[PDB]
Amino acid sequence: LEVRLLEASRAFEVSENGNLVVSGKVYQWDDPDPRLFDHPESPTPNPT
């Protein structure tokens, strides 16, 4: 698998024998926020 990065466009492609496999945008998280990983309250109480 060969992966090419386009830094300016924040784009990547994963190719296997010159055929597209994955595509998207990958970039660094400048300011991580721990609050993002707080568990959302479940819609079902499930008390029992």
Next chain:
Amino acid sequence: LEVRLLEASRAFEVSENGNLVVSGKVYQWDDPDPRLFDHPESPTPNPT
């Protein structure tokens, strides 16, 4: 200027000092058709 190609996605990218300037798609024209260059029906048939 830096030109990067993504053959699988047929996408190119031009950048200057890391700032994207041009983006788009490019690929070899497999079967050119000379009909594509016949001059189109003129908007004004008889300018006279």
